Every structure is written in C-alpha cells, then in structure tokens.
C-alpha cells in the first residue's frame, strides 16, 4: 500500500494511491478533458507549476514514447488520475506510465474522484493544491504547502522555462510511416523565422518547418534589436506558462517589432503578449480552458473549429484597441480566441493550432502566417 494524498487550498482532501515519485508537489490544480494525449499534455511547458487532473478515468492505456514529448521534460507539477491501467497496450509504447513518471520524478496520485474534483474546480474556480506521496501523508502539511503557494496570478513563468542560449530548429513533423524525420538542412528551408521561447512546444516548431521555415529559437528576454539584426522573415511568439502580464521584456520587444513591417504571429501565451503590446489587457480565468474538444468560431468565415486548449488567462475583448480586430471566439463561453492587427502583419490565436494532442482543425492558422511572410519577402 503506497499512499498519496491531495489537498486543496480550501482544505478539500483526496485520498489515493501513489503512482509516481515519492514526495510532494505544489501548484495550481487544473482539469483537462482530453481523452487522449496524456504524455503530450504532461510535457507541455505551459503546465509549469500546475498540477494536472485528467477527466478521462484511464490514463496510461498506451504507455509512453519519445515522439510524444512536447518538450525535453515533464513540466507538469503533478498528475491526478482516476485509474492507472494495469498495462500499456500500444505498439508505440516504450515505457509504462508509472515508470515514466517515476523516471521524470513526478509526484502523482491515482484512484481519486477526479469527477468530484473537476466539478469543484469548475464551480469554485482554480485552486492551488498539494500532493503528498509517501508512507504517511500529512494532511496538515499538505494544506499548509497548498495555502503557502504564491499563485500563478502575476507569476512570470516564461522566464523560467525558456532556453539558455539561442538555437536552430529544422525539424519537421512525425508520420506514422516515417516517425520523426531527420532535421532539414538549413539551405533546404525557404523562410527564416525567429521564435521566442516562452516555453515553446516542439509541435509548433515542427509545424513551421513543415511549412518551409528554418528556425532560430531565442531566449524569452531577447531584445528586439538583437532579433532585427537577424533579418527575420517573420517573428514567432510561442506558448508558455504563467501570467503574460509581468513579461515586460517581451511586451516591449514586441512593440518594437510592431513598428516594423515584419510579420508577427503568436500562439497562446504569445497571443496574450501580442495583445498587451497592442494595448489591451489580460485577465485570469475562473478555471480556464484545458481540453481538446473546444469549439471556436472564425467569426469572419462563420465556421467552427474543434480546438486544443491550454490557457488560464485571457485577453479581455472589452479593452481591445481598435488596431486590434476580433478574429476568433470561444463557442463554449464567448471568450476571446483570435486577433489581427488592422494596421500590421500581426495576428495571434489563443488555443493551439499545433494541437498535439488534439484536433488538427486550427492548423491553417499557420498558413496565414506564411502568407504574410511570402508577401513580406515580396517586399
């Protein structure tokens, strides 16, 4: 019997079984409705300082494998699931989930009422929490650790997950037949795009190269100046953890980029930056958007897309400068999903066009970016 326990701020306790590493974990507790893609979810930098609870009871049915890693490591602070399957049954599986969590030293519990928990989060809103996996989990200590958490609000996490130095990315996407392709010769890739690592997911990068872009991955606090020196075909602003609001360095930069004619495209966090730099305000959601079944409408086309969502902050539509048009909107709750600058080659999306895991419905958003680049190069 390996105990594990989860206690929330509110003192709500969840008694379960330990399936990962021994120890404690603390962060914001969130729920994700994704019935597939657990591995991709765990390795999503956006999840830094977050304890993840998955709605789908059976997490681990297909084990794990390297190709399903969205980053170099598991960024999620902890994992909460209903059932941990006896085995992994997938030709792609290279390592069972328990061993994998253990390997990556992740604190995680199973066998709890993930439903009860979800309802609580959705009703009362996000809550910081703590997991304690050990011989005799101390409920008090847990609550203490939980209450003591500083809180994502106003927390710059982007600076904690970004790359030390910059680097190049010329790798495209996976295929069933071919798996993960060898990385593309630099001379082989048409466009050069500079991308700000705010805790960038590999799939984004891969989908860019897939589109003819060579990439230069830069640290978060990189200066616009340093960038403009590179003679970028376009600039990219990745996804990433925490509050977009305290990221002064990037907002500033972005603004500089905004004086140029350079094409600018942002995803998730990047979308929030683009907005802030644009003059709008952000807000922290009650519980956010975490799942892969989220309908979003391209208002312009009046069409719907099923999308991958991972965000706890949003752009307040009501503070939008006018140089900022509304492009997309959540069909679930009315919240802001996309924007384009009326005056510049700059646009962004709140969900994940790159999915992984999730519907490939929003992928074409990239296409537009390219369109801006190609036209830029035309000039």
């Amino acid at each position: 019997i390996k105990s594990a326990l989860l206690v929330l701020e509110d003192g709500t306790q969840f008694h379960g079984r330990a399936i990962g590493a021994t120890g404690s974990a603390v962060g914001e507790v969130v729920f994700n409705t994704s019935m597939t893609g657990y591995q991709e979810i765990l390795t999503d930098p956006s999840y830094s300082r977050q304890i993840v609870t998955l709605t789908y009871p059976h997490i681990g049915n297909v084990g794990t494998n390297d190709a399903d890693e969205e980053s170099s490591q598991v960024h999620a602070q902890g994992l909460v699931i209903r059932d941990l399957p006896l085995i992994a049954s997938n030709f792609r599986n290279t390592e069972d989930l328990s061993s994998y969590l253990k390997r990556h030293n992740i604190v995680a519990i199973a066998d709890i009422d993930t439903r009860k928990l979800t309802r609580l989060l959705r009703e009362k809103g996000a809550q910081n929490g703590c997991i304690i996996a050990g011989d005799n989990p101390d409920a008090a200590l847990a609550l203490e650790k939980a209450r003591a958490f500083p809180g994502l609000n106003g927390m710059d996490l982007a600076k904690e997950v970004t790359t030390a130095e910059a680097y190049s990315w010329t790798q495209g996407s996976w295929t069933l037949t071919g798996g993960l392709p060898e990385a593309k010769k630099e001379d082989e890739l048409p466009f050069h795009v500079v991308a700000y690592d705010f805790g960038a997911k590999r799939n984004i990068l891969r989908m860019l190269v897939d589109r003819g872009c060579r990439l230069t991955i830069v640290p978060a606090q990189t200066s616009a100046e340093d960038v403009l020196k590179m003679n970028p075909d376009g600039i990219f602003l990745s996804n990433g953890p925490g509050d977009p609001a305290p990221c002064d360095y990037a907002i500033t930069a972005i603004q500089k980029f905004l004086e140029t004619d350079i094409p600018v495209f942002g995803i998730c966090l990047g979308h929030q930056l683009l907005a802030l730099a644009s003059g709008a305000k952000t807000v922290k959601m009650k519980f956010g958007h975490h799942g892969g079944n989220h309908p979003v409408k391209d208002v312009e086309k009046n069409v719907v897309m099923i999308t991958a969502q991972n965000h706890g902050f949003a752009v307040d539509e009501a503070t939008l400068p006018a140089n900022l048009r509304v492009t997309h909107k959540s069909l679930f709750d009315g919240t802001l999903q996309g924007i384009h600058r009326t005056d510049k080659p700059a646009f962004s999306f709140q969900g994940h066009p790159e999915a992984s895991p999730g519907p490939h419905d929003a992928a074409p958003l990239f296409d537009h970016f390219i369109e801006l680049i190609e036209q830029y190069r035309k000039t």
């Binding site: 399957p85 439903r115 979800t118 959705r122 799942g291």
Partner: protein
C-alpha cells in the same frame, strides 16, 4: 454487450461471425472499464451476476472446451475467458486465441484473481476495506455471495452495515466542464453523490426490461414509455430504470429522471434507497422486472398495480388451477408427472395429443 437467442434455434450455427445473429444489446456505464463491464454482465438478463464459471475446475476436459470457445467465439466467449484464467491460461495465450486486446484481458484476469481471494477468505474476509475495493471493480452482491457461500442479501446487508453504497454521477457530454439540469445518471462507488433527489414531488418508478430478446421486445418498452409519458403529464415525477441503449425508454427526454442501470434487485434497491418513490411499476417491462416484484416488495419496495402475489397466483400453475376451479371455468385436462411411466398413465388419463411443459 450483445444479447443472443441461440437456445431458441437448436439447429443453428452459434459461432460468431460477420453476419449479425444477436437479438438485442445492453449497455452499462462505469467509472472504470472493469466496473463498466461487470455492470453490463449483470444487466444482460442471462442469469449472469458477472463472470460466472462455465466449466468446472476439476473437469479434465475443461481446457479443451475453453480453448475451442476462445478460438471460435460464440455468445459465451466472455465467460470462457475468465474460465481460461482460472484454469491457468496466460493473457498471451488468451490473446493468441482471441485476438482481444491485452489491455482488456488483463482486467478480466485481475477480476479473476480477486474472485479467488474472496473465495478463499469467505464472508469473514470481507472487511469494509476490501468489500469496497470489490464494489469499485463492479462486483455484484450476487457474485460475491456465490464466492463466499452466502445469500446475496447477506452481502447486501453487509454493505448496509459498512454503509457501503454507490454514488450517482451524471451524463453531461462534457466531462463536468459544464453544469447540467438533466437527470441522466449511473451508479459508481465513488465519493461525491450527484443524485440530488427531490423531496418535492410524489415519484413514480418504471422498471424497464433490459436488453431485448425474443419474447421480450419493444412492445414492453413501448408500455414502459407510456407509463412514463402519462404519469408525468399527470404531474408525477417519473423515474425510469433501464439499460437498453436501443430504446425510447433510455432517452433522457422520456422521463424526469433516468437511471441507466442494470434492472436488478441490487441496482434497483439502491435507487429506491435514495429516491424513496411513492410507487414502483414492475408489470410493464416484461419478464425482467416481473421476476423482481416479490423480492422488491419484501425489501419494502412500494410496488404499485397488481401485487406480486396476485401475479404469482396467475403464474403458478397450481395457484391458478385452483382459482379457475373456484370460478368454475374450462381448463384443459392437466397432470404433473415426475416419472416417465407415471406420465404414460397420467397421459392415458388426460388424452392425446399432449402438451408437455417443463
């Protein structure tokens, strides 16, 4: 789980193939596969309480039977699989024979292992900690009882004791990301209860027939719906209990509250426990609910309409003969023969041709 009727077709080929041969189907919902699967088995209306054994352990030819049943599936294959584990076949061996994904097989295997524990420890061994573990796996009272050598009711009382009852969750299409005003629920052994019964109205319970089979068709379900539509119109709070995925009865629109559960004593008693209806109709869903009436009334269930006893009076061949007698009505000459030779004589009496009912 599909429902078949091979016994009605003695001469037919009972092996499963690409041409459908099932007559109906039952559905179950569980917080886990195990739970879900066992619930479906118990709601199948085949006399199964779960993974009841099909062959004896001491049967020297048992491995042979099991192998055939595994390699060339019939409607009983699901049971033969647990029998395989009992008999010592490995998950791999089973897999090679069935091609059923190991992901599923391993779970059945686990269940078998736990069954073994039960059997070993007996009713004494069913502490609350373990008993709860078993319930969370979808184990039925009836099943555990056979394993422990006790009446089903004993296991059920036992749960009363430990205050070990299921909770009701809701179907909402969105994994609880959104609130729902609909009462479409299922039972699970979890923490939070979502039933939230009303204290407000007088409630009426309608018991469905489970999966359709020959003789237990849509006709009964038709009735069931009508009971619901009617009483509700009449302003009663209607509660449907059924687990047939094909019908109108399991359409959330049909009643106020829908409990998508196995139409069993156990399952029903749990609903009544939290619902405490004004009454329950068991005369409309066919043989399924009918066979539960007596037990339900005994457990203090408010069975409305023709009493279970009255029912029995008609169905009992003896009870009946009596009242027809009493009504001075015409009945065909009958006899209740035990032995062959007895019959021949009793036969001579009655007169040929003859209808032999077993």
């Amino acid at each position: 789980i599909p429902r078949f009727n091979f016994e009605k077709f003695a001469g037919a080929n009972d092996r499963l193939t690409t041409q459908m041969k099932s007559v109906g189907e039952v559905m179950a919902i569980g917080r886990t596969q195990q739970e879900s699967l066992q619930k479906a088995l118990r709601g199948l209306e085949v006399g199964a309480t779960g993974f009841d054994p099909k062959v004896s352990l001491d049967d020297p030819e048992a491995l042979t039977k099991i192998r055939r049943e595994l390699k060339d599936a019939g409607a009983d294959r699901i049971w033969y699989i647990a029998d395989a584990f009992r008999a010592g076949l490995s998950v791999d061996g089973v897999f090679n024979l069935t091609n059923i994904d190991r992901w599923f097989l391993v779970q059945i295997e686990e269940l078998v292992r736990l069954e073994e524990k039960v059997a070993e420890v007996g009713i004494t061994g069913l502490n609350a900690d373990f008993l709860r573990q078993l319930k969370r796996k979808g184990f039925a009272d009836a099943r555990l009882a056979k394993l422990a050598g006790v009446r089903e009711a004993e296991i059920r009382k036992l749960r009363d004791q430990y205050d070990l009852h299921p909770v009701y969750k809701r179907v909402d299409t969105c994994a609880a990301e959104f609130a729902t005003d609909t009462a479409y629920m299922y039972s699970t052994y979890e923490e939070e209860c979502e039933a939230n019964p009303s204290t407000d109205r007088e409630k009426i319970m309608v018991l469905g027939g489970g999966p359709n089979r020959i003789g237990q068709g849509i006709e009964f379900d038709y009735c069931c719906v009508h009971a619901s539509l009617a009483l509700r119109e009449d302003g009663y709070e209607t509660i449907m209990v059924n687990c047939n995925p094909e019908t109108v009865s399991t359409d959330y629109d049909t009643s106020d509250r829908l409990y998508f559960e196995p139409v069993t004593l156990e399952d029903v008693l749990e609903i009544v426990r939290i619902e405490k209806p004004k009454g329950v109709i068991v005369q409309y869903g066919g043989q399924t609910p009918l066979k539960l009436a007596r037990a339900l009334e005994a457990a203090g269930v408010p069975v409305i309409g023709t009493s279970p006893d009255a029912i029995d009076r008609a169905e009992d061949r003896e009870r009946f003969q009596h009242a027809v007698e009493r009504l001075k009505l015409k009945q065909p000459a009958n006899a209740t023969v035990t032995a062959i030779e007895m019959a021949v004589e009793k036969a001579k009496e009655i007169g040929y041709p003859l209808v032999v009912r077993p």
